[PDB]
Design a binder for this molecule. Structure first.
Ligand SMILES: CCCCCCCCCCCC(=O)OC[C@H](COP(=O)(O)OCC[N+](C)(C)C)OC(=O)CCCCCCCCCCC
Ligand SMILES: CCCCCCCCCCCC(=O)OC[C@H](COP(=O)(O)OCC[N+](C)(C)C)OC(=O)CCCCCCCCCCC
Ligand SMILES: CCCCCCCCCCCC(=O)OC[C@H](COP(=O)(O)OCC[N+](C)(C)C)OC(=O)CCCCCCCCCCC
Ligand SMILES: CCCCCCCCCCCC(=O)OC[C@H](COP(=O)(O)OCC[N+](C)(C)C)OC(=O)CCCCCCCCCCC
Ligand SMILES: CCCCCCCCCCCC(=O)OC[C@H](COP(=O)(O)OCC[N+](C)(C)C)OC(=O)CCCCCCCCCCC
Ligand SMILES: [Cl-]
Ligand SMILES: [Cl-]
Ligand SMILES: [Cl-]
Ligand SMILES: [Cl-]
Ligand SMILES: [Cl-]
Ligand code: NA
Lengths: 311, 311, 311, 311, 311
């Protein structure tokens, strides 16, 4: 089999559609997600045309091997998609209706800057390479683009599944490629992060601030250091959940800034003790009394500034 | 091969049955489980009919390629099922009896709200897409739906395996699709969670309450902070075991509430020390004495409340 | 190809044999193990009979596709076995000698009650489904059942590999099934658990009991809490190694009971301090002196009871 | 099919090109990366030559099985590449133009000496084995070597993708082989390591130095020991991120040297206490006062020497 | 196709050779390694013989399906090798020269007794089973056994790749099996273990010994218990790197023995405090003074004994 010939010099229009059946495995570290969907292809092959009155059959059904099917591939897949042809139907005028069910691991980058209050636009790129005989061009049949209502992605809210109707036609290795952009819009469900990471992290910090109502250096040292470790435990836990970035993330900024607070609290605790030993507890008392107000305020204002910069 | 033609205008009824041989790999985080079962299919194809007298056989055995077999797929599978045809039998009246043994990774959401005292309904959705020639509809042959007695799912009690007899018929890309719902009812074996997570977590909490019978700030600080840390160790362990959720879980609520108890115990320990230093140990004594009763009671009442809200 | 015909009304006897080449990957959490073995099959197909005079050769060699082969499957495999036909030999009378080399992940439950002093019986179930023409029945050729001397399973002692000679014939989905039980007997190598988990865990426990020869509440609180924490560290480690169970395990019982010891040691340490503060160190001295003897004994006695209940 | 025959005694020149579509999964521990690219091959096969006049076609398309294709393999792949033929075009002189899309896991060693400030040269080796008929030699068509602009590798900056134009021709198992070296130049994005590992690690060390402004042995012991533990937590985190090497890495050297600082700080803390107990706090005061300056300087100096040796 | 017939009653000699292209993924816990190599097979088939002068062609090239190839398998592979035939060449005399490129996961046990100063002998066993017609016997063509210079195995030094020239001929399931032993000799690169595990572990132990120059029970309890904890962290870390063994390993012995040192240090710290409280600090002073010398010596002597027993 060879491609359908052009009537006039026109490129072949392959109408495409992706219908999500399942979405799963959004790997933050790998910046990948798995998808199970219908891929619909539609193109006119005049060689396949027939008479409905005399043939008595409105639609003719073919096996993939029997006819010419355009070689459609995904740009951003890890391995080539696992596909199973559902149906091939030919209308009397020779319009072909291809339908396959596929599953693929899609590689699409994520912006972690606003984590865990981030939204993402996942991409699925369809592509066709033009043949020497004729040029192939992709189009979106919006009728055949959608998703099942039950499509869920654990820890995410699925906003929309749409296609950018205008293909990106360009030359690659002295031939035309026609690229389509399917978009899955999702927003992270930040709920869990509040009682699991954010609040426990704030409690340990506040516990270290009780050192401002204590004169016991040994006690204070213990408070600050111990709380500090725990901060370390949470900080590390996050790095694991997260992917390394060449930029700062929201949570990353909060976590880093909290380290400075522990460092300064240690300084205060050290200073207060030094003065007490040097028999000048009145200076020490002033610093400790200032610290009781300053820390919460600065910590609080600093957070405000950060949230402003990030949102 | 093409589908059996309709006598009158009727849709084709494909009788289905799933018999579980093996159940395994219930991944809580992935919300998936693996299954190994028999899939039985039965439909009438008049073109295949014969006379037992003329033929000298009361049954006819075909190879998949030889006859028309309905394209049955699973909706909620990760990848398309691994299937091996066991047998295809034809009765003299053109009644086809298809049997395959398959294995598949089924994606079915879980409700973690009552963890680890939760029960789940796992779903296996069978589907058939109608062809241009005729409409296909699924039915349940309850005689061919079951499970082996030895079917086990590690850390779960297998309640039942049943099918919702009435299919969910609907349009998808202008073709009728017949969807069937097979249900595997399971309930979690919470036993382990008592000596592994629940009791150790209560012991560390109770140990922090011994600070209410001590005047040593340094000793008290150590008691609360250390225990808090251990609680942190346990709190983190759970999140690894359990998926991030946009709702609170039972264990999650208990764990979060316990953080508040440590926070308040630190406040009490701080308050008691402050008064002792300000040469007013009679006030301190009252608060500490109140704390000894108040803590256990409030803790206990709060759990009662939570259990009420969750069950 | 169809099944061979009966010469009287008899069922077809398929003689089986499994010879283990390799056993590996015993996953305790998954309750699975991987196996690499020879599967030998023998049945008689009179339709394949030949005169060595005419054919030239005393034994004929066929390709699987060329002749009828009984559909033998494994019941308890995760996915269908990876098999490669080593040889298919036919003797003049039509006796077929089938040899394949396969590899499979077998799902077989484990009893953790006596961990790490447990022994297991791993099962490999062979099965055949009878056809409408004739009934198929499995048999064990004990001459072809065995294992290589070099067969090892990391962290386990391989006791025996035997077959239960009598098949389990039963009806399933209105057809007969002939099931065979191959057994791999193994016992855990508990050696490692002594210097890795058991002894370090006892040392930390005994370190806490040194609080019985101290009057320093602050030092005691450190000893008991710190050591307690370490126990926690070990406790979790086990849980990672082990599977959640609906029953208590030996190690699990020891670990849980040790928590009670820390809890009571904290009580003693609290009690002793309270009395010392209430200016009654003679009562405190009696309790501490009793504790020095009571603890080891009770701990010791308790272990005895536990070992008795478990073995 | 057999190889094209030599006109004169010349070896067959196969022109090659690799165009990266996707690069992902750079595993530091495994020293591997996954790639998805176009592989282009071009050679002259006179047997396939045709006259455009009598044929009426400027090009001819063939199925892989129909013609002779040189057996090109990758040297450094884990498993043989997953390839799909995109197009095979024959020009009138019999110049074959082959194009496949492949995906492969490439094994290429990494130099960790400058981690996380290291750059790497990833290699992809193309190879062809010469046949008994004629010698096969590889060449680079620089017009067909490149990468998509959107090619990204998480946590790395992609510098260049080039080919060493001159093949490495040599003998292997008594046949000549033509080897080509494709190079992917990348440099690590060290950004993250600063707020995640480097800075937290410096803060904990500096906190240990507050012991130089304290006379409380118990507070100092706690300060150093605790901080030391945190370092330990960070040290372990790294060796998990980072592969074991037979050489020292930059971060590894910093981490190891920091251990010496804790060890010496413990000695100082011990010495200072010993003197204080021996009723000679003037000596102790001198050592502590020296330590306040010495540590930062030595630490600071030590780093310069290290950074110098490593860069 | 059937096997080549014997001229005289001789068994068929299949000359073998394995040439390592790549060696990777040495999994200590799994006791496996992955290999990518050339497998060469050479045997003589008189049915395939031809005339050089008459034919004009020195060598004839066949497709695997066209001729008889001996069924060579690997004994110790997890799954059957992924093989791709590179070339089949027939000499006039009928000597066939087969060459495939394969990749396989080899299961070969490891001796951890001297870890991390251990050397291993990895095995690759080639096997052939005889047919009813004639007996097949393997031989090593040392000219075709080797490895690429660039073959590396992360964290290991590759010593040699050799073959035991004489096969192990034996009967299994009433047929001859000819087994060959290919050996990959490797020695572990212990460098990393010194600054990563060994030295940090010694530093924490020396820090515990500073308790011998302190009279502060509270400080000593902290020193010994904390450091002890750190030791635990390292001990556990090692357990993750290593596999459970039925024997003691070198590192395992060092780690276990170090626990005894902490246990005895706690006893000393307890004893010293008890005497101080009983108003007898002169006895306490003697024990502490003895301990300072004794611990290093015994620690040092015991280590010597251990190294002697292990090497
Ligand atoms: C520790 C200190 C507190 C950190 C909390 C940060 C929350 C925040 O500030 O984030 C705000 C986000 C929503 O932002 P968005 O939907 O992306 O808006 C983007 C549109 N702009 C660019 C116009 C703004 O979260 C929430 O709605 C609820 C957060 C409750 C957190 C409770 C603690
Ligand atoms: C921390 C404090 C202890 C927490 C214990 C909570 C357990 C609970 O109270 O949960 C309740 C569940 C059972 O619920 P169900 O079978 O879903 O009942 C459904 C019927 N309704 C809807 C009417 C309620 O647990 C148990 O059967 C055994 C509890 C043993 C726990 C020992 C500790
Ligand atoms: C923590 C406290 C110590 C725990 C050690 C329990 C050992 C035990 O009691 O286990 C006993 C098991 C043997 O059991 P079996 O082979 O299944 O006997 C089955 C036959 N019956 C049913 C008649 C009993 O181990 C051993 O052979 C030696 C154990 C050495 C452990 C050293 C410490
Ligand atoms: C812990 C103590 C401080 C550690 C910082 C080491 C950084 C370094 O010194 O590393 C050097 C690298 C760049 O190296 P390069 O691009 O490979 O240069 C190779 C070319 N030569 C041969 C001419 C040298 O860092 C940076 O560009 C920015 C580092 C910011 C770190 C801030 C803290
Ligand atoms: C913790 C306490 C220190 C432990 C150090 C163990 C070293 C050892 O004792 O091991 C010795 C091994 C070599 O052994 P081999 O080559 O296998 O000898 C086989 C030949 N025979 C049979 C004759 C013995 O290491 C080394 O060459 C360098 C050791 C540097 C370690 C730095 C610390
Ligand atoms: Cl694709
Ligand atoms: Cl399916
Ligand atoms: Cl099977
Ligand atoms: Cl390849
Ligand atoms: Cl093999
Ligand atoms: Na302390």
């Amino acid at each position: 089999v060879s491609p359908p010939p052009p009537i006039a010099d026109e490129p072949l229009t392959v109408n495409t559609g992706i219908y999500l059946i399942e979405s799963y495995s959004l790997d933050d570290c790998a910046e990948t997600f798995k998808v199970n969907a219908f891929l619909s292809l539609s193109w006119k092959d005049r060689r396949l045309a027939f008479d409905p009155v005399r043939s008595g059959v409105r639609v003719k059904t073919y096996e993939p091997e029997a006819i010419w099917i355009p070689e459609i591939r995904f740009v951003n897949v890890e391995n080539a998609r696992d596909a199973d042809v559902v149906d091939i139907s030919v209308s009397p005028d020779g319009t072909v209706q291809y339908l396959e069910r596929f599953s693929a691991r899609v590689l699409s980058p994520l912006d972690f800057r606003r984590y865990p209050f981030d939204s993402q636009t996942l991409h699925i790129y369809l592509i066709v390479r033009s043949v020497d005989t004729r040029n192939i061009v992709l189009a979106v049949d919006l009728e055949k683009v959608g998703k099942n209502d039950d499509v869920f992605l654990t820890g995410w809210d699925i906003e929309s599944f749409t296609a950018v109707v205008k293909p990106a036609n360009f030359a690659l290795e002295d031939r035309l490629e026609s690229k389509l952009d399917y978009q899955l819009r999702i927003s992270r469900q930040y709920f869990s992060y509040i009682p699991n990471i954010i609040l426990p992290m704030l409690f340990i910090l506040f516990i270290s601030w009780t050192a401002f109502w204590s004169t016991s250096y040994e006690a204070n040292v213990t408070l600050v250091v111990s709380t500090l470790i725990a901060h370390i435990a949470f900080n590390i836990l996050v790095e694991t959940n997260c992917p390394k970035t060449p930029y700062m993330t929201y949570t990353g900024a909060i976590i880093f800034m909290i380290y400075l607070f522990y460092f300064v609290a240690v300084i205060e605790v050290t200073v207060q003790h030094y003065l007490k030993v040097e028999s000048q507890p009145a200076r020490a008392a002033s610093i400790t009394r200032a610290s009781r107000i300053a820390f919460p305020v600065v910590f609080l204002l600093a957070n405000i500034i950060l949230a402003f910069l990030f949102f």
